[PDB]
Ligand binder design. Sequence first.
Ligand SMILES: CC(C)CCC[C@@H](C)[C@H]1CC[C@H]2[C@@H]3CC=C4C[C@@H](O)CC[C@]4(C)[C@H]3CC[C@]12C
Ligand SMILES: CC(C)CCC[C@@H](C)[C@H]1CC[C@H]2[C@@H]3CC=C4C[C@@H](O)CC[C@]4(C)[C@H]3CC[C@]12C
Ligand SMILES: [Zn+2]
Ligand SMILES: [Zn+2]
Lengths: 107, 107, 120, 120, 199, 199
Amino acid sequence: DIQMTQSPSSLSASLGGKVTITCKASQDINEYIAWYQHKPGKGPRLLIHYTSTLQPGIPSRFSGSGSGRDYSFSISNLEPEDIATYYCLQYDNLLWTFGGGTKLEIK
Amino acid sequence: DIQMTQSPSSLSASLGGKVTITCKASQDINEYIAWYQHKPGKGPRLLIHYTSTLQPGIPSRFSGSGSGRDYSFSISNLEPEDIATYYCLQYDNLLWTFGGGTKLEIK
Amino acid sequence: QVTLKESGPGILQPSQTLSLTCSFSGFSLSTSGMGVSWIRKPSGKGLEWLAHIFWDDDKRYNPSLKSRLTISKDTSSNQVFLMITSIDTADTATYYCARRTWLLHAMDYWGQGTSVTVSS
Amino acid sequence: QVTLKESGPGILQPSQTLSLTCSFSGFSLSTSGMGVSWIRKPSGKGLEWLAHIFWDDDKRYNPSLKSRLTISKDTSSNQVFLMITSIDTADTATYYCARRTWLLHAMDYWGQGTSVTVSS
Amino acid sequence: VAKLLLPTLSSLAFLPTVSIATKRRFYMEAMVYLFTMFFVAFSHACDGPGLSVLCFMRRDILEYFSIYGTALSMWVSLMALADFDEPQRSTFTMLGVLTIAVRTFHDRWGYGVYSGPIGTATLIIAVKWLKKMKEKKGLYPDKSIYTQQIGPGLCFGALALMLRFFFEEWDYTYVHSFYHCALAMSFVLLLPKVNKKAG
Amino acid sequence: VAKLLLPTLSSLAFLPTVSIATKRRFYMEAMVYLFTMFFVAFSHACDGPGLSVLCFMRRDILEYFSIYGTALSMWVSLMALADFDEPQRSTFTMLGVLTIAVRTFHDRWGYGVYSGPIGTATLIIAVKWLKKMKEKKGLYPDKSIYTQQIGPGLCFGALALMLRFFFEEWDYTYVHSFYHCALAMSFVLLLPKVNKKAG
Ligand SMILES: CC(C)CCC[C@@H](C)[C@H]1CC[C@H]2[C@@H]3CC=C4C[C@@H](O)CC[C@]4(C)[C@H]3CC[C@]12C
Ligand SMILES: CC(C)CCC[C@@H](C)[C@H]1CC[C@H]2[C@@H]3CC=C4C[C@@H](O)CC[C@]4(C)[C@H]3CC[C@]12C
Ligand SMILES: [Zn+2]
Ligand SMILES: [Zn+2]
C-alpha cells in the first residue's frame, strides 16, 4: 500500500490562532489527498479534497496545498469548534490509506 | 552518501563449484561499481570495474553484471585460492562507499 | 439529506463471524457512479479502510484482510452488509459506513459508526 | 611494477594526532590524471573511505571525518601523508594507501596496510 | 492603417504563451510557440505591402512554417494536456512532428492540416481519460481541471477556429487578429499548471 | 540491372537499425529511422526509370523527406548518445527537428544540411563529456564505450560521409549502396545499449 505520514500526532494552539498539519506519502498520490475532521461520538466531515478544493458549506479558514508526495492542510482564525482530530486520506488508488491523525488541543 | 548492500555477509561453497554475490545501491551508481578480493595480511586486488570489465591478468571465471541500482558478481570453477573476502565499491561520486563485504568459506 | 447508519452485535467472542449492517437514505447505491465503503478505527489507533462496494456490482478489499472480509448489497432495502470472518480481539474497533461518489472519488458522508468489542 | 607502502605509529593514546605516511614507486602522483586515496578497515567492520589527493593538487574527505582529516603530498619523495586529528578508540583500524588512475576512476593498486591500535 | 499592422502586431499574442510555458518548465512547447510566433509574425509582415521589404526569406518558407508551426503548436498543447509518461511522451511528440510535416508539405491549404492534429489528439486524450475513468471509477481529471483548464481552453480553441474558418469570410483585419488572441489564450489554458516530468 | 534496384534495395539497410532501436526501447529514434527508411527507399524507387511508375507522391516530397529524414536520423542518433535528462532531452530533440526543417526547406542541396546537425551535436556532446570528465576527474564514458560504440560508430559515420560526398564522384550505383549500409551501421553503433529513460 501507500503509507501516509501526518507529522504532528497532536498539536496545542490558542483560539483565534493559526495551525498547519503536514503529511508525506511514501509514493506520489497525484494530488488525490482529502482532509477529514473527526469529533468524539460523530461521523467524520470532509473539509478538503484533491489537495486544495474546499467542500461546499465549509468555513473558508481551512486550506490545503501540495503536489507530488508532500501535502499540507491549515486552519486560520481557529474557533473552539475546530478542537477535533484531523485525518488525511490517500485516494489515488482504490486501496485507500489514511494518515495516523492529528489531535488538535486548546492552549 | 550512497549505501552499498552485499546480500550474503558470508557464503560457504565446494571447490570446483559456482558462487554469486549480489549488491543493491540505495541510489543508482551508473555501472560505476568495482569488485575487490581481500585476504588476511595482503592488500586487496581489483578483479572487475565498471560492473563487468575484468582487470588484465584476472582469471576469467570472475564475472559481474547489473545496470542502474542492482549489481552482481560471480566466481565459476571455484579454486581454493578464491577463499577470501569480496568487497563492492561504489565510485560514481568521489564520495567512495564500499559494501559490507562477503567472506567466502570452503564446504 | 444523505444519511448512513451502522448496526452490529456490539459483543462477540473470538473465532466467529462479525455481521455488520449499513442502512442509508437520500441516495440509492444502484444510482450511476455511486459507492459505499467500510472504515474502522481500532482501539487507540488511526483509521483503517476495509472494503468497497459499487453501483456496477464491483467490490474491493484491504489486502491485509482480503481473506476474511466479504461485502454484499440490498438496494430494495437501501442497505449494504459487511461479513468479517474468524474474529480476533484486534478487531476491537468502531466500524463506519461511508458513501463515495463519481465526481469526488473520496467518501463525502459517514455514518456515526458502531462500536464492536470482541473478547472472552 | 607499481607499489604503495604505509607507515604509522602503531600505538597512540586518544585525543592526539595520527600521522600516517604512504610511500610509492612505479608511478609519480604529479603524472597527469594520477591520484592516491586512503581507506581503513575498522576493528571487526567493513571498509571505510577517508581521503583523496590528486595530480592537480585537488583533495576530497569523507563528510563523517572531514573536520579532523588532512591530506598532503611530496612528489620529490614519492610520498603522501594523512593527518587524523583528535584520535578516538573507534580509530582502531588497518589503514590502506591505494592508487587511482584517469582511465579507471576506481583504485587499481593497494598497499599491504598498517595496523593502528589506539587506547589507554 | 490597420490592414498591414494589426495582423502583424496580434502575432505577438503568443509571447504571453511562450512566457507562461517557460515559467511552468514546458520548454519544448515554449520552443514550438516561439518558432510559431516568429514565422506567423514575419508571414504577416512579409504580406503587408508597406513593410514587405522587411522579410529576409521568401514567402514560400514563411508561409509554410507559419502553417506548420501553427498545426504543431496545437499538437504539443494537446499532448502536454494528455500528460504521457516515457517512452510514449516523445513517441507521440515525434508522431505529430513527422505527420504534420508530410501533410503540410503535400498541401498546406488542404483539409486535415489543423483538424488532423486536433481530431487525432482529441481521440488520443479521450481514449486515455476513459481508460483512467474506468480505473478511478470516477471523473479522472478533477472537476476543477475541467472547469478551469479544459472547458475554457477548448472554448477559446473553438472560438479561434470559427473566427479563422467561418467569420474571416466577412472581414480579415480584425477577425484574423482576434483569432491570434483566441488561439494564444487557448494554448495558455490547455497547458497544465507545471511540467510534472521537469518539476 | 543494378542501376535501378541496388540503391533502392540497400535503403532496407536501416531496417536492422529500426529493429535494434525498437528492441532497446528507443521508440522515438525507431520512428525517425523507419520514416527515413521509407522516404529514402521510395525516393530511389521513384528515380529509377523501370519502377518510377510505383511512387504515389511527387518527386519534390520524396526528395525533401529523404534528405530531412537522413539529417534528423543523424541528429537523434547523436542526441541518444548525448543521453540528456528532462527537460533538455525533449528541448534538444525539438531544436534539431525545427532547425533541420527550416534549413532543408531553404536549400536541401546547400552546405550545412548534414554538417550542421553533426557539427552542432558533436559540440553539444564534447561540452557535456568534458564537463563530466572534470566532475569524474577521469575519462567519462568508460574505455569500453569508446572502443565498442563511439570509435566504431564514428568510423562507420566518417566512412558513410566520405563514400557519399567524395567517392560518389567516381561511381553512384555501388558507392551510394555502401553509404546506406555504412550509415545504418553507424546509427546501430552510436545508439546506447538500452534507453535508460524507458528501461
Ligand atoms: C498522430 C498523427 C496521425 C497526427 C495527424 C496527422 C494529420 C495532419 C494527417 C495524417 C493523414 C492525414 C489525412 C490524409 C489525407 C486526407 C485526404 C483529404 O481529402 C481529407 C483529409 C485526409 C483524410 C487527411 C487528414 C489529416 C491526416 C489525418
Ligand atoms: C541545434 C541546431 C543548431 C542544429 C543545426 C541546424 C543546422 C541545419 C543549421 C542552422 C543554421 C545553419 C547555417 C545557416 C547558413 C549557412 C550558410 C551557408 O553558406 C553555410 C552553412 C550555414 C552556416 C548553415 C550551417 C547549418 C546550420 C548551422
Ligand atoms: Zn496568422
Ligand atoms: Zn540515399
